[PDB]
Design a binder for these strands. Structure first.
Ligand SMILES: [Zn+2]
Lengths: 49, 94, 61, 364
RNA sequence: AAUAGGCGGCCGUCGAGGGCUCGGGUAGAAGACCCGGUUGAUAGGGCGGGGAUGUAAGCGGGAAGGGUCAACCGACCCGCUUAGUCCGCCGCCCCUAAUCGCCCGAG
RNA sequence: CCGACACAGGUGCCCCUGGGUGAGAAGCCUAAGGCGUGUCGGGGGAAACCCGGCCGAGGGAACUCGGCAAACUGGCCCCGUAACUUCGGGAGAAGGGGUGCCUGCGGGUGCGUAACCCGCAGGUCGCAGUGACUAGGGGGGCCCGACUGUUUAAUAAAAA
RNA sequence: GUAAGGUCCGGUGGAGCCGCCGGUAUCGCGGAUCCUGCCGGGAGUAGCAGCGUAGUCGGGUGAGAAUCCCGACCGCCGGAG
RNA sequence: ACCGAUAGCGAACUAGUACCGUGAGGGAAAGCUGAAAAGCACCCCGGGAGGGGGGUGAAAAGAGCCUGAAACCGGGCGGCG
């Protein structure tokens, strides 16, 4: 469960570098469960990303 | 000795290892020395070092750890899995 | 020079490509003929009795 | 022709190996008529300097001169054994040895800690840290019988030498607790006289003042400071190779010719440097001080300890010696001294020289 | 030293003595060697001594001048200040760790 | 990708570059972007010796085939500048003085109290003011080839 | 049996083999820096440095974590990485 | 009266194949369980790979499979040490 796809898609969505993405260290299970761009957008709106 | 749920103040002499290691390994060597010193002086099987303490050690880069570090050691007992009882010492700044 | 550094300049157009007639990768692309069967240079096949490759093809040597 | 030069280093100190024991051994003793113990022991403390009116023959006689000195702390030794030597087939062989029975120890610096009374130390307890197997149920009567047997052997004449077995007392100066046990010869020409001299002081304390005389020459025996493994450049003083050498500069060039087809033992090589048994000759004993203090002119008394204490050493609290020049060994090393075995023909007078200044400034 | 030595002591016909482990260097490439181990000042810590640099931060005042010739800015200087910082040196104090444990061993 | 390789080479550095200092696409620091994969880790007064780097009292080439290597000088401004000469040069010849910070004025272009650049007076600190970084040592004879250029890819760059 | 070798005994093996006469032949190996295959000592040694010396703390996953993942700190490149 | 898997054609077999060279061209290694898969059901241990029991078979011949030589390596025994 490496969050490379999630980090890359979040960076692409937010229009920034991949090193500027912050992922909540307490919601790693939610981030790993998120597998689609819709789920990643939902996490971004929630504030995990 | 220190019993469970008790709190002590220690002064770790980090300068004891500056000249025995290369200048660019001094911060990790200081972290190792602090952990070993706390374990020996608290008779603790496990030591948990606070990220604040780690940042204080790494404040001036990998080459200049502080010569002396004042730390706060709290001793707790877990007794997990039945393998006797384990003593865990938590290290915080000041 | 003349060695390992020289071998790094093999990223240009290949000298030989696949031949439409004989099926081997021997077609001189720049000149326009096959170095194996002579396609593009002769109507007849390029066979030489000092060569054993065409015999090897059919196990006739 | 070729170019000649003396060889690098001396072959008279080979093998250059680590000393057999940290406690020095004495192989030869001076010949004297006075009945006294031929030497003493102490611990190296540090170095300082004085200004003194020279009394030795030479150009600078009668002029005030600078003089470096070394301070050796010498707490009194404990005389606790007597050994007898007979003449064997190939040399001296020990015939018997008698030690005194256990006695209470009163110079031990006992300290009251929280709970428990004074430890109340006794002998055979500090000595156990060195011998580890001491007599059990040993009594004064049995000691007297053993001494009488030794004396009877002396009267019969089977004994050709007698020596005193002494032990250091580092606990007096708080340096350590494990003592050093050494054997010392006694001057004179009568075995009976030497035996009486040892017997009258068996079980007692001997001070450097009762043994040595101020202003006399001594031989100093110790183990030099260790340097670890050192290359030939430092070990034998060879010349560095040419600066264009691409295989190194701190090494010997040729380690031998074609023939003999072996490396000769005389070729310098790297190895152990320092920590060697060495003897220094003709070191003058400038002065003897008592209780860490030195008197100058019957009204001035100074503390030999410099301000801030000796570097890597504590404070001198017992009797001490002032030796002109430097002595081998490190700080806190055990040093043995004996009367000079080959003194010069024109020796300096046997008395303390006129001292005008003693340095007690900080040495760190 | 193959004539492979002498002596004192302790042990055996459970057991003297020793090793690993522990705190440190008079020592050190690994081994080895040396001091200490509650029969305690070995290291840390606290206090004091001695030393090395050179007078800390903060505040008050002055400062060539400017500024509505006011408020205010200002390199730098003076006082608190032989200060501050630091010590691979020493002394005193058992507050902390030198604990627990394991192994070999002649008969 | 090619070189037998997750090869410090070559192909491709082929096209593009925020802020400060600075003449600068220089060096140094830093934003964005990227990385901790130019991928075996741990210990140590734990040596000798080797490779890379810093310093060294007095002397200053006495070393050596040979000043090899290293060292001196170094940016900018102002004075000053030889033999010889193909009159163009030599030439940055050589040699000498200055350089920081603060306070305040003057000048050029400019509508401007916008921006850039050039001077003046005073105060003051340190051993040292191009304080790090960047950054020539110089001169006099002789041989050869006029010069810029080319060469033995892999021991000769030269008077060829 | 001088010998080149022959034959028996005990064990493994599971399907072919031998004495004598007369013929026949790719008919006998220790070497050719011989050829092919397999295996030793070197050796649990060298190498895993040099031109960019980079990791630490807390948490997670997992039988198993210096090396995988998240956060913080500390670093490198930044007219090129 | 040829050879019997280093022999016989280079190829007894997915052989002019894999693979080497820009290119003409060059070119290997590799056969065998058992009569019958009857190719090991079930139990204990291990994260797994596997190990130990227990079964099939006249015989494990156990698929890493007919016989299993020599070199080499580990252990046991006899002798020296
Ligand atoms: Zn063709």
């Amino acid at each position: 469960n490496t969050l490379k796809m999630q980090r890359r898609i979040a960076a692409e969505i937010l229009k920034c570098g991949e090193n500027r993405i912050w992922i909540d260290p307490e919601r790693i299970d939610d981030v790993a469960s998120a597998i689609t761009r819709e789920d990643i957008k939902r996490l971004i709106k929630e504030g995990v990303i | 000795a220190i019993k469970a749920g008790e709190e002590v103040i220690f002064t770790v002499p980090i300068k004891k290892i500056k000249k025995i290691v290369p200048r660019w390994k001094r911060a990790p060597r200081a972290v190792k020395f602090v952990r070993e010193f706390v374990a020996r002086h608290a008779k603790a099987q496990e030591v948990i070092i606070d990220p604040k303490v780690n940042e204080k050690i790494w404040e001036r880069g990998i080459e200049k750890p502080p010569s002396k570090l004042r730390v706060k050691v709290k001793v707790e007992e877990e007794k997990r899995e039945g393998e006797e009882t384990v003593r865990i010492a938590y290290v915080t700044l000041a | 020079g003349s060695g390992t550094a020289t071998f790094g300049k093999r990223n240009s157009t290949p000298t030989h490509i696949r031949c439409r007639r004989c099926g081997r990768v021997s077609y001189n692309v720049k000149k326009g003929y096959c170095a194996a069967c002579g396609f593009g240079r002769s109507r007849r096949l390029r066979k030489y009795r000092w060569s054993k490759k065409w015999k090897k093809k059919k196990n006739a040597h | 022709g070729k170019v000649h030069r003396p060889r690098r280093g001396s072959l008279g100190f080979s093998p250059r190996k680590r000393a057999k024991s940290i406690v020095p051994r004495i192989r030869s003793w001076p010949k004297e008529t006075e009945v006294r113990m031929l030497g003493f022991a102490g611990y190296k403390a540090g170095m300082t300097h004085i200004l003194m009116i020279d009394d030795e023959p030479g150009l600078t006689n009668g002029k005030e001169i600078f003089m470096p000195v070394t301070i050796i702390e010498t707490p009194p030794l404990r005389v606790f054994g007597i050994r007898a030597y007979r003449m064997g087939y190939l040399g001296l062989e020990t015939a018997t040895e008698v030690i005194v029975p256990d006695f209470p120890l009163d110079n031990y610096p006992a300290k009251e800690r929280k709970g428990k009374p004074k430890p109340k130390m006794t002998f055979y307890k500090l000595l156990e840290r060195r011998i580890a197997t001491l007599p059990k149920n040993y009594t004064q009567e049995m000691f007297e019988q053993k001494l009488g047997q030794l004396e009877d052997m002396i009267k019969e004449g089977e004994i050709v030498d007698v020596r005193a077995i002494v032990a250091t007392q580092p606990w007096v100066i708080k340096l350590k607790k494990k003592p050093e046990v050494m054997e010392y010869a006694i001057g004179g020409t009568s075995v009976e006289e030497k035996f009486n001299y040892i017997k009258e002081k068996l079980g007692k304390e001997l001070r450097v003042g009762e043994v040595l005389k101020e202003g006399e020459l001594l031989d100093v025996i110790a183990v030099t400071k260790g340097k670890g493994t050192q290359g030939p450049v430092k070990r034998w003083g060879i010349k560095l190779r040419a600066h264009k050498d691409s295989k190194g500069r701190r090494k010997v060039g040729s380690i031998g010719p074609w023939h003999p087809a072996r490396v000769m033992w005389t070729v310098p090589m790297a190895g152990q440097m320092g920590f060697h048994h060495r003897t220094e000759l003709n070191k003058r004993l400038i002065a003897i001080g008592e209780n860490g203090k030195l008197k100058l002119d019957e009204n001035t008394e100074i503390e030999i300890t410099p301000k801030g204490g000796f570097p890597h050493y504590g404070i001198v609290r017992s009797d001490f010696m002032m030796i002109a020049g430097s002595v081998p060994g490190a700080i806190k090393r055990i040093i043995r001294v004996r009367p000079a075995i080959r003194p010069p023909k024109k020796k300096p007078p046997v008395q303390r020289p006129q001292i005008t200044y003693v340095s007690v400034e900080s040495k760190q």
